[PDB]
Symmetry: none
Subunit: 122 residues, 2 copies
């Protein structure tokens, strides 16, 4: 669930992470549109596309099983569908980490208006 | 590396794991063709696709950092590319565990000819 996605971000990117990543560019959040602004936003675009692949459960509100250890996150449990949600979130988190160097506050709480164009196909 | 993937499988599924899983269905090998035979084969299909998204390193040959502990598998390391490989591998082996109920020796060492049909795209 997004509640877990937030915790996962805070653990991997630090306590200020949720505020830093849950409203960025055109896709960071949930249910974006238009063209990704930069690499970090591309992470969220892939994340959104990932949630779109989940059909046996609700990636937005269904809770999954995961662990925290040495800065990283590990997906657990035995439910195939829930494990798939967790994987979508885990990949997005490491992606934020790998692209930290180009994060631009210019796209922080960017505003939907600039994203109102045909969305890039997954 | 596939060597390590093999270690994971035997650790989680037992000493017979590699022999029962890496030669199953149409995809547990690599470069699978055709249609996934069942849930277990589906684990490998996803595994292939996961390997397909790895850029910068070799999922088949490159070695990563991981540990086998308390019945679970944990990925680590300093290289993001290699950690991605390890994630594909650990997810695939627990997927095998989740679907052990539908494992069927009929698909064990399935012939490649039985897999000679239009391949499912990732």
């Amino acid at each position: 669930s997004l509640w877990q996605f937030g915790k996962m971000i805070n653990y991997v990117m630090g306590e200020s992470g949720v505020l830093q990543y849950l409203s960025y560019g055109c896709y960071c959040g949930l249910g974006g549109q238009g063209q990704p602004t930069d690499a970090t936003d591309r992470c969220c675009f892939v994340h959104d596309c990932c949630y779109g692949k989940v059909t046996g459960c609700d990636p937005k509100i269904d809770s999954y099983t995961y662990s925290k250890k040495n800065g990283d996150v590990v997906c657990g449990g035995d439910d195939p569908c829930k494990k798939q949600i967790c994987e979508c979130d885990r990949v997005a988190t490491t992606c934020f980490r790998d692209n930290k160097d180009t994060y631009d506050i210019k796209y922080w709480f960017y505003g939907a208006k600039n994203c109102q164009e045909k969305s890039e196909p997954c």
